[PDB]
Amino acid sequence: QPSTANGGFPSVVVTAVTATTSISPDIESTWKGLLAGESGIHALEDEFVTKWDLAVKIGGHLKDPVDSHMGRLDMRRMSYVQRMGKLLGGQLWESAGSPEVDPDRFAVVVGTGLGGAERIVESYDLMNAGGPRKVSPLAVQMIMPNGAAAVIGLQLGARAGVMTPVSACSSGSEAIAHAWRQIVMGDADVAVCGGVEGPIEALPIAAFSMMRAMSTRNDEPERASRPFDKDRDGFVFGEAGALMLIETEEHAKARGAKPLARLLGAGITSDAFHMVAPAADGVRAGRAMTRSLELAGLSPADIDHVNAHGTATPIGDAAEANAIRVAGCDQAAVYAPKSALGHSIGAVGALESVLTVLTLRDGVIPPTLNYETPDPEIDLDVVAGEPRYGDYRYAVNNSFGFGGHNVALAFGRY
Amino acid sequence: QPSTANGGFPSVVVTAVTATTSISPDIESTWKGLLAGESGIHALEDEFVTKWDLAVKIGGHLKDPVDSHMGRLDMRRMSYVQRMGKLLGGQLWESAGSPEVDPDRFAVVVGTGLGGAERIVESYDLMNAGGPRKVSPLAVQMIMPNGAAAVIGLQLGARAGVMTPVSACSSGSEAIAHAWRQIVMGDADVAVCGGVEGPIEALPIAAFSMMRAMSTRNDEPERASRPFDKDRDGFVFGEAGALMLIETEEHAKARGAKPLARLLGAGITSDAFHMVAPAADGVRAGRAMTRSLELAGLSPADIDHVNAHGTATPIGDAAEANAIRVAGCDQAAVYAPKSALGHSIGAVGALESVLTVLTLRDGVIPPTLNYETPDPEIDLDVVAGEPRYGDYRYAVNNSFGFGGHNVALAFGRY
Numbered sequence: 001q002p003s004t005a006n007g008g009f010p011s012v013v014v015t016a017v018t019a020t021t022s023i024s025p026d027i028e029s030t031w032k033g034l035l036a037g038e039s040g041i042h043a044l045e046d047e048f049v050t051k052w053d054l055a056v057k058i059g060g061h062l063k064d065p066v067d068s069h070m071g072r073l074d075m076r077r078m079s080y081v082q083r084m085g086k087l088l089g090g091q092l093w094e095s096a097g098s099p100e101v102d103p104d105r106f107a108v109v110v111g112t113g114l115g116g117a118e119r120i121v122e123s124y125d126l127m128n129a130g131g132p133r134k135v136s137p138l139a140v141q142m143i144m145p146n147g148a149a150a151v152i153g154l155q156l157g158a159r160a161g162v163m164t165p166v167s168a169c170s171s172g173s174e175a176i177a178h179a180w181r182q183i184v185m186g187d188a189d190v191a192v193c194g195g196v197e198g199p200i201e202a203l204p205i206a207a208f209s210m211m212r213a214m215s216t217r218n219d220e221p222e223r224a225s226r227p228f229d230k231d232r233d234g235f236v237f238g239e240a241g242a243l244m245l246i247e248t249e250e251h252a253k254a255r256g257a258k259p260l261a262r263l264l265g266a267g268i269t270s271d272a273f274h275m276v277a278p279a280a281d282g283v284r285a286g287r288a289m290t291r292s293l294e295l296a297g298l299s300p301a302d303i304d305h306v307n308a309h310g311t312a313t314p315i316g317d318a319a320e321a322n323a324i325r326v327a328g329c330d331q332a333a334v335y336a337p338k339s340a341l342g343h344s345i346g347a348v349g350a351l352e353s354v355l356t357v358l359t360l361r362d363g364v365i366p367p368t369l370n371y372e373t374p375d376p377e378i379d380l381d382v383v384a385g386e387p388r389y390g391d392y393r394y395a396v397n398n399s400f401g402f403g404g405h406n407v408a409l410a411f412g413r414y
Numbered sequence: 415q416p417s418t419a420n421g422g423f424p425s426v427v428v429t430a431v432t433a434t435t436s437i438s439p440d441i442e443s444t445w446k447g448l449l450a451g452e453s454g455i456h457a458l459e460d461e462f463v464t465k466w467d468l469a470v471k472i473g474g475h476l477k478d479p480v481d482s483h484m485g486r487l488d489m490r491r492m493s494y495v496q497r498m499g500k501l502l503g504g505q506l507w508e509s510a511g512s513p514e515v516d517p518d519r520f521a522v523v524v525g526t527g528l529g530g531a532e533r534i535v536e537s538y539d540l541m542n543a544g545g546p547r548k549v550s551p552l553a554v555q556m557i558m559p560n561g562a563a564a565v566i567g568l569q570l571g572a573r574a575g576v577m578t579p580v581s582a583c584s585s586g587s588e589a590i591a592h593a594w595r596q597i598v599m600g601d602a603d604v605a606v607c608g609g610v611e612g613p614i615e616a617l618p619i620a621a622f623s624m625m626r627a628m629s630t631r632n633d634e635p636e637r638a639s640r641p642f643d644k645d646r647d648g649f650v651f652g653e654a655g656a657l658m659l660i661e662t663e664e665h666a667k668a669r670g671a672k673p674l675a676r677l678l679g680a681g682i683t684s685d686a687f688h689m690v691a692p693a694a695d696g697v698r699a700g701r702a703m704t705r706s707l708e709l710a711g712l713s714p715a716d717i718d719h720v721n722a723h724g725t726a727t728p729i730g731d732a733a734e735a736n737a738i739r740v741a742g743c744d745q746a747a748v749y750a751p752k753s754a755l756g757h758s759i760g761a762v763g764a765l766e767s768v769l770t771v772l773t774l775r776d777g778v779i780p781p782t783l784n785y786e787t788p789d790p791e792i793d794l795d796v797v798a799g800e801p802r803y804g805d806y807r808y809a810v811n812n813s814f815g816f817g818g819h820n821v822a823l824a825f826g827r828y
């Protein structure tokens with residue numbers, strides 16, 4: 001059956017990446033900080049933590065706020081994720097040399113966890129106060145969850161499809177998966193793909209912490225996100241947004257673009273087990289990893305690196321450990337970037353995909369922070385202490401979102 | 415290049431359909447009503463129209479409300495679209511004979527326009543009143559827009575992927591498109607696909623009517639939705655939710671299922687022109703129709719029927735008329751079901767896909783209501799007056815949502 005290795009699918013490569021994180025607005029500066037063991041998780045100086053006395057007092061805001069780049073009109077015309085999307089879309093295109101592509105062969109796939117939710121309550125108040133004629137004619141285009149992808153496609157002139165997949169923590173990775181499908185199926189030759197997500201606020205914290213899914217180690221904020229560690233106690237919020245430019249290898253050579261890595265395959269499965277909790281056996285999540293290898297043309301032996309979902313919840317890490325074993329990749333070097341960057345829901349899958357690309361390019365994996373006592377039930381070779389330089393040829397990025405959505409992206413060194 | 419006609423793609427057929435509309439909760443009763451010229455659009459006895467003195471006083475609520483089938487627990491555990499999804503998912507499976515499929519080969523793709531938006535403001539109030547511990551642990555799984563698809567996949571046991579595409583009015587059609595992709599790419603053999611959407615309320619009416627996109631013919635509610643008519647003045651809301659069961663032809667023969675029609679191809683393009691308005695030249699929208707024919711293996715001559723997007727806005731119908739001309743399908747018989755069923759955003763593309771399947775099965779197209787004075791600039795052969803019985807071999811369903819999202823589904827008579 002067709003595969004990228006046997007020529008069944010056209011070769012797709014990553015040619016540009018961009019991300020804003022709790023470490024830095026510059027993806028290369030974030031990469032450097034991760035290698036130095038830096039963490040973006042700190043104590044929250046926000047007034048809503050003292051106002052509600054939240055159980056969670058830790059999390060990482062963006063190092064460079066999005067609205068510090070937004071004028072009066074952008075604060076008027078777009079939602080937050082649309083503002084983040086326009087900012088990241090412009091940085092990505094300039095970083096790629098601002099090429100002139102065929103719009104009819106240019107697609108955009110940007111995932112998100114919720115959408116323009118804050119614009120719902122704004123138009124909600126604007127009518128309760130003054131009536132229906134006080135809701136802006138731009139309200140519809142601000143609230144629609146496809147708005148971020150629509151803003152990016154309109155800004156860059158993408159006419160081969162503008163899509164927005166929704167799947168909680170796997171939204172960002174699934175967007176890259178569908179952009180890869182849009183190319184190998186012949187519907188496009190170049191695609192901007194990634195994920196955006198809103199900022200940290202009181203209601204997201206309350207909703208997720210009521211599931212006992214978040215960490216409560218407020219005394220040491222940098223030490224709280226402990227994926228695969230035995231003293232973990234949930235995940236930590238870490239604001240992020242990431243986009244990458246993918247295109248066929250022949251499209252990259254024709255415009256003189258230096259590819260950063262290869263996008264080899266993508267697998268999408270589902271648990272059908274629980275509305276928020278992952279399946280303990282990790283069979284379907286591991287099947288997503290296997291599916292990405294089949295479309296790539298690889299076997300579990302070729303996988304040298306696994307960028308794990310690793311949220312640091314007790315049940316999540318244990319389920320992924322079984323998933324990696326089911327996929328036969330338990331000999332690979334594992335990295336859990338949420339140990340330093342936290343969880344950004346709809347954008348984290350895209351961010352960790354960029355980190356996977358940077359790992360293959362530089363042949364180095366940053367250390368998983370706070371991994372000090374290995375969980376006995378979780379026996380995996382995770383990188384810790386200091387960066388591990390290695391000959392990493394192929395890597396798989398995992399993203400298992402709430403609702404049982406499993407997405408695995410197979411990446412290869414260029 | 416691979417196609418369904420030349421064996422490049424496996425043959426996919428529709429084996430079961432289900433929908434709740436403003437006409438009837440039974441899809442066959444809705445089909446009968448459409449053929450008799452019935453309309454689901456009436457005057458709104460809702461108190462919010464008199465409360466805000468809305469410019470729009472027309473629209474069609476569901477003939478059978480969703481919550482009339484929902485007990486105390488369902489009103490506690492799920493959002494509206496999740497409640498609609500669970501209801502439609504159960505009706506679809508029973509209508510298909512309740513088969514036992516391989517869960518690892520069973521996928522679900524359900525689109526929606528917004529998600530569990532009303533659960534945001536509920537948890538918003540529940541914390542303002544009593545604090546963070548008053549938000550339910552089920553709040554996360556109710557608000558996530560992937561919730562409707564997640565509820566259906568968990569109810570039916572779909573483990574080959576649960577996806578939720580967001581693209582406004584094309585969400586329902588795009589879901590069927592990705593489910594067709596999930597099958598022909600080998601990731602699944604059977605898929606439940608469709609769209610769900612929330613009910614008519616004051617804020618959706620105010621937001622869309624501020625764009626001058628809705629009809630104001632409140633004196634004659636049944637006469638207001640006039641797609642391709644010269645006295646049209648916007649669209650009319652019509653609540654709906656629809657799901658269909660698609661599977662490979664060999665999967666349908668192995669379980670003794672009578673196919674209703676064939677799903678032959680799907681094309682997804684984007685305008686990249688305006689945040690809400692369609693491109694006047696209709697080039698990209700028509701390209702989506704052409705793309706569905708290429709994947710199907712057909713040419714514009716084979717298209718006997720076009721289930722038009724036809725919202726009855728002045729700019730929308732004119733843009734689609736150019737799109738049909740660009741695709742070379744302007745000789746086909748056109749049907750605009752929004753003339754009788756209205757617009758249901760994220761669900762209407764799925765509903766009109768079911769109507770396309772029923773048209774090919776019964777060889778008849780219902781009359782486009784209120785089409786009495788053809789627009790001079792719009793010269794197309796639309797069905798009107800009474801149902802037109804014909805030898806319809808192939809049909810294309812159009813869905814051009816806000817944001818420039820164009821999806822065309824190519825269907826063939828079985």
Ligand SMILES: CCCCCS(=O)(=O)Nc1ccc2[nH]c(C#N)c(C)c2c1
Nearest residue numbers: 114118198199201204237238239344345
């Ligand atoms: C770092 C991860 C935080 C989770 C965010 S989220 O999962 O809850 N989704 C979401 C989407 C859009 C949003 N806009 C606003 C405003 N203002 C908020 C709070 C917001 C949240």
Ligand SMILES: CCCCCS(=O)(=O)Nc1ccc2[nH]c(C#N)c(C)c2c1
Nearest residue numbers: 528532612613615618651652653758759
């Ligand atoms: C018939 C078409 C109407 C448009 C609906 S919509 O496009 O505005 N999307 C949406 C999604 C979920 C919702 N839940 C609730 C409640 N309660 C509402 C009002 C709602 C609306």
Ligand code: NA
Nearest residue numbers: 307308309398
């Ligand atoms: Na990962």
Ligand code: NA
Nearest residue numbers: 721722723812
């Ligand atoms: Na249609």
